[PDB]
């Protein structure tokens, strides 16, 4: 339903148009509501009296359950526990509060429901913002890699910046380390996993010397297919002129960029 744990909670512990919002009831009971006036003037006696009796002297309520359920629901929507664990932990927290209760505890509980509401919102927006963890992993890997290439350097650093931009600009992409290598998955539960360490090791020898040799397919077999996928995934990035043209790497990047381009364009055209 709603992600805001306050909202996704308050649907559970609440009546409908009771005296929790006193102003609306008091407006409707006299005549003040304009949507349908004289509605309350013509109800049975008991009901009328009862509301009125409720209205003049409100009845106090115990909000402990509401706050505890709010924080429990926040934990559930934030993958702190499984839903069955949610049903259990609600009672657990309820007992915990009930055996240590104090005004200070209620104050801290209100503070906590505010904090968890903010936490859920922040987690969602951060998960849709770019997943800083992948950026950290990529920076660690790049620190592992050397920053100096004896044959050509502008293309190398340009490509490195292009990769950085690619991992930053597309959230849901994963960068991590499983074994003694770093990888790059284009999506959770997704295919196209590139062995980043192996790709860089293979590509180290092709940076500044494959420009004159791009015309002859004599060294074309040096490109392992994993690195070919790695280059393919960066076709939309590293636009023309970023990588020096007339280079085997540059030629491949330009071809892939042109191909992907015709495609998306034609596709948004559809019909």
């Amino acid at each position: 339903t709603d992600p805001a744990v306050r909202a996704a909670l308050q649907s559970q512990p609440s009546g409908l148009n009771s005296t929790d919002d006193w102003r609306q009831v008091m407006d409707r009971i006299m005549s003040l509501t304009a949507r349908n006036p004289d509605a309350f003037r013509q109800q049975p006696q008991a009901n009328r009296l009862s509301a009125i009796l409720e209205a003049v002297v409100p009845a106090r309520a115990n909000p402990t359950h509401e706050k505890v359920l709010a924080i429990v629901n926040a934990l559930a929507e934030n993958r702190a526990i499984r839903p069955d664990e949610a049903g259990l932990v609600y009672d657990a927290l309820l007992q915990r509060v009930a055996r240590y209760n104090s005004g200070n505890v209620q104050t801290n509980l209100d503070r906590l429901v505010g904090d968890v509401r903010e936490a859920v919102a922040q987690r969602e927006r951060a998960q849709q913002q770019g997943n800083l963890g992948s950026m950290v992993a990529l920076n660690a890997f790049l620190s592992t890699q050397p920053a100096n290439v004896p044959r050509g350097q502008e293309d190398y650093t340009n490509f490195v910046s292009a990769l950085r931009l690619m991992v930053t600009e597309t959230p849901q992409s994963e960068v991590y380390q499983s074994g003694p290598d770093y990888f790059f998955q284009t999506s959770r539960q997704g295919l196209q996993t590139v062995n980043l360490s192996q790709a860089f090791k293979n590509l180290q020898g092709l940076w500044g010397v494959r420009a004159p040799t791009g015309d002859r397919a004599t060294v074309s077999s040096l490109l392992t297919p994993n690195s070919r996928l790695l280059l393919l995934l960066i076709a939309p990035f590293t636009d023309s002129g970023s990588v020096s043209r007339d280079t085997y790497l540059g030629h491949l990047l330009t071809l892939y960029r042109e191909a992907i381009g015709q495609a998306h364009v034609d596709e948004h055209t559809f019909q």
């Binding site: 049975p44 006696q45 008991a46 009296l49």
Partner: protein
């Protein structure tokens, strides 16, 4: 032809039921809470019954 003088007796049987006298103004079931029941509540008045 020789029928004797007759005197009529009338009686009725109503089993498996209870006579009901609802506490409502017009005797009909207009709701679970009768209107007169509503009138008497909140009156805070005690009454004796015979």
């Amino acid at each position: 032809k020789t029928a004797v003088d007759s005197i009529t007796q009338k009686k009725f049987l109503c089993d498996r039921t209870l006579w009901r006298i609802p506490f409502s103004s017009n005797f009909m079931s207009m709701g679970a809470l009768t209107d007169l029941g509503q009138n008497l509540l909140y009156a805070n008045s005690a009454h004796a019954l015979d």
